[PDB]
Amino acid sequence: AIKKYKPTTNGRRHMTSSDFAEITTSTPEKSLLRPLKKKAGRNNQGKLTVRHHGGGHKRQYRVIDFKRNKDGIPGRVATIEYDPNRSANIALINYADGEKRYIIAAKGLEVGQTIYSGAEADIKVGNALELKDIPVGTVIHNIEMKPGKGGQLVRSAGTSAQVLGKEGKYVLIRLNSGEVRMILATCRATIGQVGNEQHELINIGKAGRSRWMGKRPTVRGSVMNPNDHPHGGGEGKAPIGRKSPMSPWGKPTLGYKTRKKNNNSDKFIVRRR
Amino acid sequence: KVCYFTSNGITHIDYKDVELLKKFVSERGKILPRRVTGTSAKYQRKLTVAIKRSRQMALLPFVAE
RNA sequence: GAAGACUGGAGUGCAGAAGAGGAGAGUGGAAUUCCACGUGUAGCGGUGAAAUGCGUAGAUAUGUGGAGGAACACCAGUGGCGAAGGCGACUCUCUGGUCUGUAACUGACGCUGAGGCGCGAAAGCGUGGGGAGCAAACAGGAUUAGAUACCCUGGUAGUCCACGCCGUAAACGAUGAGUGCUAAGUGUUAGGGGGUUUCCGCCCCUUAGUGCUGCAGCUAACGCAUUAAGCACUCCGCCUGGGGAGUACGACCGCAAGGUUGAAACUCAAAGGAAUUGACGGGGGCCCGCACAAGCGGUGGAGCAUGUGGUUUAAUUCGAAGCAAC
Ligand SMILES: [Mg+2]
Ligand SMILES: [Mg+2]
Ligand SMILES: [Mg+2]
Ligand SMILES: [Mg+2]
Ligand SMILES: [Mg+2]
Ligand SMILES: [Mg+2]
Ligand SMILES: [Mg+2]
Ligand SMILES: [Mg+2]
Ligand SMILES: [Mg+2]
Ligand SMILES: [Mg+2]
Ligand SMILES: [Mg+2]
Ligand SMILES: [Mg+2]
Ligand SMILES: [Mg+2]
Ligand SMILES: [Mg+2]
Ligand SMILES: [Mg+2]
Ligand SMILES: [Mg+2]
Ligand SMILES: [Mg+2]
Ligand SMILES: [Mg+2]
Ligand SMILES: [Mg+2]
Ligand SMILES: [Mg+2]
Ligand SMILES: [Mg+2]
Ligand SMILES: [Mg+2]
Ligand SMILES: [Mg+2]
Ligand SMILES: [Mg+2]
Ligand SMILES: [Mg+2]
Ligand SMILES: [Mg+2]
Ligand SMILES: [Mg+2]
Ligand SMILES: [Mg+2]
Ligand SMILES: [Mg+2]
Ligand SMILES: [Mg+2]
Ligand SMILES: [Mg+2]
Ligand SMILES: [Mg+2]
Ligand SMILES: [Mg+2]
Ligand SMILES: [Mg+2]
Ligand SMILES: [Mg+2]
Ligand SMILES: [Mg+2]
Ligand SMILES: [Mg+2]
Ligand SMILES: [Mg+2]
Ligand SMILES: [Mg+2]
Ligand SMILES: [Mg+2]
Ligand SMILES: [Mg+2]
Ligand SMILES: [Mg+2]
Ligand SMILES: [Mg+2]
Ligand SMILES: [Mg+2]
Ligand SMILES: [Mg+2]
């Protein structure tokens, strides 16, 4: 659920958090950990290209199975764990062989169940199927775009997509952002909504807690100097004395569409959000 | 008039006896009021539950024609 | 008051019956909406009239399939259940009460109940899901002298679900709970006993509910009348002319809106219930009249006589003002 804190201090007045009730264990699978290093938005050349990054708690990558290409082997759910590298939780799965892999824990997944991948798998939560085998109307996640690559499309916490109809070599799908998109029928997907549905209700409550996740302060352009931002300068507080609000590099920022006007995948999108 | 069930003494209305129930429905599957078939109140209630049960298992039509 | 005794009040046992009484978990079929794909062409919708609105990126219509939410057609009945609010699709689990017969058992164990504790339509509040129709606020088009409304097209909170608050209503039978006594007639719901009868069926007696009509009696009247507003006994709540006013102050409760308790100064000579006789209604029935219809012929058109208004003048003497002045 969501845990509230009593206002014993001013920095904990409105802070809320998760109770981590669905997490089973606390020790990761040592054979599936890889190191990460913070980049802080720094570039190939050492320059700062993306700002407001860097300086948080150190983490450790643990490899997730997005491909889901182990077919015909029953797999038992062992634990449900915590992954700092993503919003959703993850579930450790040990197949009958003795091979252990991580997946994205869907809603309703619990310890003791069994999941399958392939063409004979049932329409059940956690199973992975090719889109040509999934009946119309079901709720799916972890959609992949190119066959054999791995799931890319719907992966965040508490997100879902729905199959609308099949029309030949392609399949219509309404993505989480609300657009009807057309993708191949040989791609794979996983049935069910993604797990940690309550992630969006959390109140940070502190500036330091925001700093713990690796965020640096954001300075509004209106308090900068004329050579620093198009909004800068002016005696006293000044309004946006321009035709339109501007990004730090020009290029109006309020309503101005930035998608390329000659994109190749324009024909595979039916309607936009 | 005359209660059909009481006249013939039948005291158990069952949903499997699909041939009996079809007498008390209209040509469309609607149940008929007890002031047309003349059945007594205590047995109209039993009749209505049995028809609703057997409507569910495709033994009788919900709307027919 | 104390000690005994009893069974009719009260409760238990035994045998039967009916029920939208409650909570949880599943499931079903009609229909409005949306989506995908067939056919088809220029309309669709709406009103007292019209416009906004949707439609050639091809609708309304039509056939197939899918998604999702909400309410449960016929049965349905001054029928049923519940202490009140209230409860209508189907199945299962967990549960509360009630009625009839028996006379097996205890032997007054009963009634009412200030403070207290619980339940309590709809709106509304807090955290979070869900969102098909409907729709405060709102936007546009109409209507009107104006229209911050009724009408038309959309539309958010809300209506739905989980948990926690709120504590109110024309929460009404405008009728507190318990008990006994006091003519009849007739429907209906759930039972029991008996006569006739091969069953079927008709009749009589009886218990507990639910309606109608009526005597004694009661009432200001309307009306109530074995489901009393009749005749009596026990306990509880409330009233003492209208406004100020369910207001102010104090207190308790609430996240908030608010809820419960609750006056006085001042002011008026009335406020009020029921029934009667008229009058009126953009209430309803029936009858009549050159009132309409069926006719014949005029007026309004053109030219003049003529009365009124208007207007111009020193005066253009006064009175008439739809029908009912000209
Ligand atoms: Mg930033
Ligand atoms: Mg995480
Ligand atoms: Mg400065
Ligand atoms: Mg500049
Ligand atoms: Mg400036
Ligand atoms: Mg200045
Ligand atoms: Mg007794
Ligand atoms: Mg029930
Ligand atoms: Mg159509
Ligand atoms: Mg009752
Ligand atoms: Mg004895
Ligand atoms: Mg009591
Ligand atoms: Mg009290
Ligand atoms: Mg409500
Ligand atoms: Mg509407
Ligand atoms: Mg009250
Ligand atoms: Mg009521
Ligand atoms: Mg009553
Ligand atoms: Mg009252
Ligand atoms: Mg009274
Ligand atoms: Mg009294
Ligand atoms: Mg009394
Ligand atoms: Mg009595
Ligand atoms: Mg009495
Ligand atoms: Mg009776
Ligand atoms: Mg009798
Ligand atoms: Mg009863
Ligand atoms: Mg009676
Ligand atoms: Mg009296
Ligand atoms: Mg009467
Ligand atoms: Mg009596
Ligand atoms: Mg009564
Ligand atoms: Mg009285
Ligand atoms: Mg008093
Ligand atoms: Mg007074
Ligand atoms: Mg006074
Ligand atoms: Mg009167
Ligand atoms: Mg005429
Ligand atoms: Mg003629
Ligand atoms: Mg004529
Ligand atoms: Mg003529
Ligand atoms: Mg002439
Ligand atoms: Mg004159
Ligand atoms: Mg005059
Ligand atoms: Mg007149």
From TrEMBL, chain A:
InterPro entries: NA-bd_OB-fold (IPR012340), Rib_uL2_dom2 (IPR014722), Ribosomal_uL2 (IPR002171), Ribosomal_uL2_bac/org-type (IPR005880), Ribosomal_uL2_C (IPR022669), Ribosomal_uL2_CS (IPR022671), Ribosomal_uL2_dom3 (IPR014726), Ribosomal_uL2_RNA-bd_dom (IPR022666). Keywords: Metal-binding, Ribonucleoprotein, Ribosomal protein, RNA-binding, rRNA-binding. Pfam families: Ribosomal_L2_C, Ribosomal_L2_N. Residues 123-252 form the Large ribosomal subunit protein uL2 C-terminal domain. The keyword Nucleus does not apply. Coiled coil: none annotated. Mg(2+) 4 binds at G236. One of its GO terms (biological process) is cytoplasmic translation. GO terms for cellular component: large ribosomal subunit. Mg(2+) 5 binds at S247. This is Large ribosomal subunit protein uL2. It comes from Listeria innocua.
UniProtKB/TrEMBL annotation, chain B:
The keyword Ribosomal protein applies. Keywords: Ribonucleoprotein, Ribosomal protein, RNA-binding, rRNA-binding. It comes from the Bacteria. One of its GO terms (molecular function) is structural constituent of ribosome. One of its GO terms (biological process) is translation. The keyword Transmembrane does not apply. Belongs to the bacterial ribosomal protein bS18 family. Part of the 30S ribosomal subunit. Forms a tight heterodimer with protein bS6. Binds as a heterodimer with protein bS6 to the central domain of the 16S rRNA, where it helps stabilize the platform of the 30S subunit. This is Small ribosomal subunit protein bS18. The chain holds residues 13 to 77 of 79 of the full protein.
